[PDB]
């Protein structure tokens, strides 16, 4: 886990044609709808009954945007990430709670909107660069646990 | 289980795949490699740089595998009886990669589908390649 | 898939430990939480201090369940269905932990039966492991 | 790879003990049978459709050895394992192919054969070290596959 220019540039730059805020409300939008149980985290937020609910509530397209606002930023921490959220870790670990496997669920159901958005461009190897990026900041979002 | 809300769902957006079929079976597997290198370790003899012709049969060989599974989602373990099997006991390939095929697919599945993946029916979907991969990995031990 | 010998197997290992129990439970555990601390996340509201009280009775109730799986092992859905209801509904217990902690157990036994714990009964016990949180992990749609 | 000084000592301190071509037949010998399909890199090797034949085999007494006197070299360059680890890493991805979850399947599998070779000298937070240290172990071996 040490991304590569080439690669480490797909992120960085095709990240580029990005809108945070529709894109977190959905991804933030599809993990809470695909794995029920991060649910676990919000009844705080309303209903997230159905898909529909879920999916069109303003408490969660509200954390997604700014669950990938700081995101965003680590793309421009590449070198860096651990660096980047330790701050940003110890956080959700020491005071948040949060069953860290959540990180590479939503790397994932991330890869996965991206999927969606961006369609033939998504090509396999920005996916993949998208790939290490998910998984390594999953993990500098990981590292202060204990 | 499946429920037959996620059984529609799948049985359609699988009908508009329909016969692409094969093509969602070859970049599957193709950005299978890029991105998760190590499950490469199964193909020493294949030839897999872009284009291959190999990766492509592979591929419609992937996908007629879960047409069969689609037009067989109640019958799903006798369905794939036999493939069951086959990489049990033939090419025994740690099962942890089976996780890793089902997402891919996903993402073309993905990827292709503008309109046609609600996450209502993204669920449905990452849902079924893992009882379909559970079949699979049922004879392992 | 238990097989039959799988099956005397679980059953004359769990009979050894006959009442250690809720103590090769608590034991379990301790050990869950100081070589992965993930799983901590989720016991925020514990004394997970080392012999606290906290743990000894989950613990009991923790190795109770087992128990009684290894006494149903013709029926476990029903056996711990009601224990499966609370798992996937109210805890939401990342299914990933699950292996962590059978992880732990397998690995308690290995220290308290020296040689009621063969070859032939790891492979055994990690199975009986194993079917134990995917009916617990089931309830999860 | 990241050990402690009371952890390293602990660690340091179960093997003097560890019997090497023995716990060591042993691991390899259990997760041949424990999950069955590592079968797929022996059969050149001969009967493992047995236990029995599959603890008294040979080729597998042998092989096990090899894995553990590699292993037991290693608990050395602690402080750098991606370090000494790296043409085995080097060859188990290019000439042998093996699936790295293995190397994460047996460090699994060598923390049981120690917890049943030691007793309540194997305590928890020995087990928490040598877990860190299987950790690194594999980590390490997998390092460079591509
Ligand atoms: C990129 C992966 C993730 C990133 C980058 C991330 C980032 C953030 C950031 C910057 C905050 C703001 C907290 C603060 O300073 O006040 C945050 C808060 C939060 N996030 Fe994480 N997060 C991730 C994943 C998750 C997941 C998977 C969950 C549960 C599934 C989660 C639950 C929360 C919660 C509950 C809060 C606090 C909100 C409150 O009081 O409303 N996050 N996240
Ligand atoms: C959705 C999960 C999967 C499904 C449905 C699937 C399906 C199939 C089907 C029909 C076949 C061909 C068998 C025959 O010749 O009759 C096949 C072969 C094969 N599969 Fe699976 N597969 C899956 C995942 C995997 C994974 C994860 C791997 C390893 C990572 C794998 C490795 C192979 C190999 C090596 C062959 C044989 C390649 C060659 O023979 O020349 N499959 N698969
Ligand atoms: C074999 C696997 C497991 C079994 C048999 C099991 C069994 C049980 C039982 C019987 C209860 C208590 C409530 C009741 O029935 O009155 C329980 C509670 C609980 N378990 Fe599970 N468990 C298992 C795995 C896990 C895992 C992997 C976690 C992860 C953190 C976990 C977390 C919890 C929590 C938080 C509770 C409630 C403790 C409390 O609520 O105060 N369990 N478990
Ligand atoms: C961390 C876990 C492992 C270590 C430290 C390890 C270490 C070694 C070493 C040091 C060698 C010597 C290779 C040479 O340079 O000739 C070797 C060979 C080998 N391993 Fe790896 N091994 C591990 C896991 C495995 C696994 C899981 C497999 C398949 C399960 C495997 C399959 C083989 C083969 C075929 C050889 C060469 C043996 C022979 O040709 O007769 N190793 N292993």
């Known amino acids: 886990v040490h991304l590569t220019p080439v ?42 009954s159905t898909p529909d609910a879920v999916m069109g509530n303003p408490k969660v397209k509200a954390h997604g945007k700014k669950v990938l606002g700081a995101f965003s930023d680590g793309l421009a921490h590449l070198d860096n990430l651990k660096g980047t959220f ?8 020491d005071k948040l709670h949060v069953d860290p496997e959540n990180f590479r669920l939503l790397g994932n159901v991330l890869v996965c909107v991206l999927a969606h958005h961006f369609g ?6 920005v996916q993949a660069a ?17 | ?8 769902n799948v049985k359609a957006a699988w009908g508009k795949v329909g016969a692409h079929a094969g093509e969602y079976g070859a970049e599957a597997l193709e950005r299978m490699f890029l991105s998760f290198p190590t499950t490469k370790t ?5 030839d897999l740089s872009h284009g291959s012709a190999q990766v492509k049969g592979h591929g419609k060989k992937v996908a007629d595998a879960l047409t069969n599974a689609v037009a067989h989602v109640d019958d799903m373990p006798n369905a794939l009886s036999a493939l069951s099997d086959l990489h049990a006991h033939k090419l025994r390939v740690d099962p942890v990669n089976f996780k890793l095929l089902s997402h891919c697919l996903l993402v073309t599945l993905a990827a ?24 699979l990995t049922s004879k392992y031990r």
Request: charged residues 20%; glycine residues 6%.
């Open chain 1, 7 to 48: 690669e480490k540039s797909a992120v960085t730059a095709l990240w580029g044609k990005v809108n945070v805020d529709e894109v977190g409300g959905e991804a933030l939008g599809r993990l809470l709808v695909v794995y029920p149980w991060t649910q676990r985290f919000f009844e705080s937020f309303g209903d997230l």
């Open chain 1, 86 to 93: 330790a701050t940003l870790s110890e956080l959700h670990c």
């Open chain 1, 120 to 125: 033939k461009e998504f090509t396999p190897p």
């Open chain 1, 130 to 146: 998208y790939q290490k990026v998910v998984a390594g900041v999953a993990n500098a979002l990981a590292h202060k646990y204990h």
């Open chain 2, 1 to 8: 289980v499946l429920s037959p809300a996620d059984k529609t």
């Open chain 2, 42 to 46: 199964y193909f020493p003899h294949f």
């Open chain 2, 112 to 135: 292709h589908l503008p309109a046609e993946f609600t996450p209502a029916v993204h669920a449905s979907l990452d849902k079924f390649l893992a009882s379909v991969s559970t079949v």
